[PDB]
Amino acid sequence: SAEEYNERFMEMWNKIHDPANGYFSADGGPYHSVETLIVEAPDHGHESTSEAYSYFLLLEAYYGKVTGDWSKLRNAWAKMEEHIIPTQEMQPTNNFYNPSKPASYAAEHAQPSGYPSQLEFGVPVGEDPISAKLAQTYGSWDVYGMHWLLDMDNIYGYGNLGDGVSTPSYINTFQRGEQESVWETVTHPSWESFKWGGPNGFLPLFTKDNNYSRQWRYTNAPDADARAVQVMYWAYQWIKEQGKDPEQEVPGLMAKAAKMGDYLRLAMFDKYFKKMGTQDKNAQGGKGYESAHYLMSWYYAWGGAADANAGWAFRIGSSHVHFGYQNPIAAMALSEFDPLKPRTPGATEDWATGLKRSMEFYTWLQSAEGGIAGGATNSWDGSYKPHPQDRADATFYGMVYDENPVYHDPGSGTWFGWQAWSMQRVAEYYYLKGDAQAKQLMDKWAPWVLSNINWLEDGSFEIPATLEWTGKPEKWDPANPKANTNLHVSVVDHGQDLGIAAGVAKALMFYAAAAEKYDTPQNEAKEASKKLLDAMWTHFKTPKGLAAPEKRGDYARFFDKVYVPGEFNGSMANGDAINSESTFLSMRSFYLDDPMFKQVEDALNSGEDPVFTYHRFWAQTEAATAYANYAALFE
Numbered sequence: 092s093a094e095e096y097n098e099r100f101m102e103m104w105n106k107i108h109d110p111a112n113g114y115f116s117a118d119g120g121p122y123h124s125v126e127t128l129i130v131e132a133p134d135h136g137h138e139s140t141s142e143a144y145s146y147f148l149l150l151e152a153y154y155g156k157v158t159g160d161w162s163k164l165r166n167a168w169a170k171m172e173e174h175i176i177p178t179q180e181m182q183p184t185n186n187f188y189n190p191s192k193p194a195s196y197a198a199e200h201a202q203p204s205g206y207p208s209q210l211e212f213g214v215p216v217g218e219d220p221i222s223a224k225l226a227q228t229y230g231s232w233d234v235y236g237m238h239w240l241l242d243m244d245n246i247y248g249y250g251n252l253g254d255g256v257s258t259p260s261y262i263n264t265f266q267r268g269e270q271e272s273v274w275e276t277v278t279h280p281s282w283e284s285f286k287w288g289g290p291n292g293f294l295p296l297f298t299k300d301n302n303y304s305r306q307w308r309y310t311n312a313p314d315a316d317a318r319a320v321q322v323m324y325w326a327y328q329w330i331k332e333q334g335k336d337p338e339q340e341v342p343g344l345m346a347k348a349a350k351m352g353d354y355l356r357l358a359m360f361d362k363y364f365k366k367m368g369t370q371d372k373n374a375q376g377g378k379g380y381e382s383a384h385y386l387m388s389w390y391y392a393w394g395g396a397a398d399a400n401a402g403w404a405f406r407i408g409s410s411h412v413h414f415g416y417q418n419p420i421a422a423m424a425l426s427e428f429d430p431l432k433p434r435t436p437g438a439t440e441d442w443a444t445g446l447k448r449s450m451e452f453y454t455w456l457q458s459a460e461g462g463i464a465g466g467a468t469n470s471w472d473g474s475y476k477p478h479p480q481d482r483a484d485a486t487f488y489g490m491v492y493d494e495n496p497v498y499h500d501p502g503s504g505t506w507f508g509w510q511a512w513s514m515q516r517v518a519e520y521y522y523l524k525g526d527a528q529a530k531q532l533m534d535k536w537a538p539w540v541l542s543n544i545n546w547l548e549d550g551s552f553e554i555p556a557t558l559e560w561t562g563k564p565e566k567w568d569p570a571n572p573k574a575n576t577n578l579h580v581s582v583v584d585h586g587q588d589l590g591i592a593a594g595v596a597k598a599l600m601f602y603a604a605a606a607e608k609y610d611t612p613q614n615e616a617k618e619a620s621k622k623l624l625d626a627m628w629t630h631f632k633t634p635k636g637l638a639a640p641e642k643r644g645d646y647a648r649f650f651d652k653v654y655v656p657g658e659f660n661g662s663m664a665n666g667d668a669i670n671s672e673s674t675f676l677s678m679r680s681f682y683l684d685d686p687m688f689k690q691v692e693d694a695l696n697s698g699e700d701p702v703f704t705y706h707r708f709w710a711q712t713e714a715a716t717a718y719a720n721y722a723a724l725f726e
C-alpha cells in the first residue's frame with residue numbers, strides 16, 4: 092500500500108526531527124551526520140554543507156506532500172538563508188568588484204606542496220558577462236548563493252567575522268589542488284581577520300603575493316544550489332496537487348529559488364573566464380559567453396578585501412566539470428517553469444542552453460557498459476596547458492575529457508554515488524517530459540546498475556561502490572554522435588551505502604514510471620526499486636534511522652603528515668600548531684576528546700579497520716523520502 096510506504100517515511104521523518112537523535116545543531120540547522128567522527132568531504136560530522144541544506148529542503152518538501160503542512164518547508168528555507176547564505180555584513184565589499192577584471196590568475200598544482208601559488212598579474216582574465224546585470228536586477232552587488240561548508244558547533248573556534256563564538260561558523264578547507272585530499276587541508280575561516288594562522292592568517296598557505304590583506308570569501312557547491320531549485324519545482328507541483336496556492340503555502344520562496352538559480356549561472360563559466368578551448372594561460376580571456384560551458388562546474392567563488400586600502404573583489408567560475416553535478420531538472424525549471432524563471436535578461440536562455448548541453452554531456456560520457464564517465468576540463472593541469480596528445484581528440488565544446496575531474500585522492504571518477512545522484516535526475520526528466528535522450532541514457536544505465544547489484548543470502552544486498560575506468564569517449568559531435576566503444580567501466584568494489592542505495596531506488600522508480608507512461612514497462616527496474624527499499628527496511632533499522640556498518644581503513648590517515656611550507660608558522664584557534672610537522676589530527680586535537688577516536692586508535696592498534704554505523708543527514712533523508720517517492724509514483 093501507499094499508506095505503508097508513507098508510514099515508513101513518516102517514521103523516518105520523526106526520527107530525524109526527534110531532538111534525542113541529534114540530527115540538528117543548537118541553531119536548528121542539519122549536521123552532516125549525527126556522529127562527530129567522520130572524514131570524507133567535510134572533516135567533522137558536526138560540520139554542515141550546502142548539500143545537507145538542500146536535502147533539508149527535500150525532506151520538508153516531502154513532509155508537505157504527505158501531510159499538507161508546508162510550514163516545515165518554510166522553516167527550512169529560512170534556516171538556509173539565516174545560516175548559509177552570507178548576509179550583507181558578511182559579504183561587505185562586493186562594491187569593489189569589477190566584472191571587466193573579475194580576478195587574478197594563479198596556477199593550480201599537481202600536489203599541495205605546489206602551494207602557495209603565485210598570483211600572476213600579467214595573465215589575462217576574461218570578462219564576467221552576468222554580474223553587472225544580476226546587480227541591476229536585485230539592487231545589490233551581493234551574491235545570493237549558498238557557501239558550501241559550515242562549522243555548526245564552532246568546533247574550530249572561528250565563529251563569524253573573526254569573533255571566535257558565533258554559529259554556524261563559515262569555514263573552508265580545500266584550496267590546494269587535485270592531490271589535496273580531505274586529509275591534507277588546513278581548515279580556515281571564510282572571514283580572514285589574521286586573528287589565527289600566521290601573521291597574515293591562513294592566506295600564505297594558498298596564494299603568494301607581495302601584500303596580504305584581510306578579506307572574506309565564499310565557495311559555492313553548484314550541485315547543492317541546483318538541488319535546492321529542483322526541490323522547489325517539485326514542491327510547487329505538490330502544493331498545486333493539493334489544490335493549495337504556493338503563494339500562501341511557501342510565500343516568497345519560488346522568487347528566492349529563481350534568484351539563487353540566477354546567481355548559480357556563475358558556475359557556468361571558466362574559472363578565469365578564459366575562452367573554451369584555451370591551451371595557453373597567456374591567452375587573452377573571453378568576452379561575453381566565449382568562456383561559458385553552460386554546465387554545473389565544481390564551484391563558483393567570490394570574495395573581497397576587508398577595506399578600501401586594498402579595494403579589490405573577485406569572482407571565479409570553475410574550469411572542471413563533473414557529470415555528477417549536472418541537473419536537467421533545475422535547468423528545465425529555471426528555463427521553462429514561469430514561477431522559477433529568473434528575472435535577469437539572458438538567464439532563461441542560459442539555462443535552456445544548459446539543459447541541452449547537460450544532456451549532450453551525459454551522452455558524450457556514457458561508457459560502452461552504461462555508466463557515465465567523469466567529465467571534462469577547460470584547464471589542463473589547472474594551467475591551461477595543451478591538451479595531451481593521447482586525449483587531444485576527446486573533446487566537448489573545447490574542453491577535454493577528464494576521467495577524474497577536480498580531485499585524484501581518491502579519484503572523483505571512482506565513486507559510484509555520482510552515478511545515482513545525477514542519473515536520478517535524468518530519470519526524473521524522462522518521467523516529466525518523456526524525453527527521448529533521457530530515455531536512451533536510462534535504457535543503458537539502468538541495466539548496468541541492475542546487473543551489478545548482488546542480492547545476498549539473508550535478503551540483503553550490496554550495491555556497486557567503487558569504479559575503475561579505462562579509455563576515452565569519442566570526439567563529441569551533436570549532429571552525428573558516435574558510440575563510445577572504447578570507454579569502459581568496471582565495478583571493482585561493492586558495499587551497503589544506504590544513501591546511495593536509496594538514490595538508486597529513486598532513479599529506478601522514476602525510470603520505471605516514465606517507461607510505463609511513455610514506452611514499454613520496465614518491471615525489473617520497478618521491482619528492484621521496491622526490493623532495495625524493502626531490504627533496507629527489514630535489515631538496517633537503527634534507533635536513529637537506517638544504517639549499515641562500514642569499514643573505514645582510511646582513518647589511518649588521521650596520523651598522516653600534512654604539507655605546510657617551511658616559511659609558514661601558524662596556530663589553529665585552540666592553539667594547535669600549523670607547521671611542517673603538522674598531521675591531520677595534530678591540527679584537529681579536539682578529536683582526542685571524541686569517544687569514537689579511542690575506537691579508531693584501538694582498531695588501528697590491533698591491525699584492524701575501524702567500523703562505524705553512520706546516520707548522514709543526506710542519506711537518512713534520501714532513504715526516508717524514497718518510500719514516499721515510491722508511494723507517490725505507484726499508489
Ligand SMILES: OC[C@H]1O[C@@H](O[C@H]2[C@H](O)[C@@H](O)[C@H](O)O[C@@H]2CO)[C@H](O)[C@@H](O)[C@@H]1O
Pocket residue numbers: 131132133140142506508588590591707
Ligand atoms: O564527495 C562526495 C560525497 O561523499 C560522501 O561520502 C562518501 C565517501 O565519498 C565515500 O568514500 C564513502 O565510502 O561513502 C561516503 C558516503 O556516501 C559525503 O557523505 C557527501 O557529503 C559528499 O558530497
Ligand SMILES: [Ca+2]
Pocket residue numbers: 226227228229230
Ligand atoms: Ca534594480
Ligand code: NA
Pocket residue numbers: 172173174175176177178
Ligand atoms: Na544569512
Ligand code: NA
Pocket residue numbers: 270271272275500
Ligand atoms: Na593526496
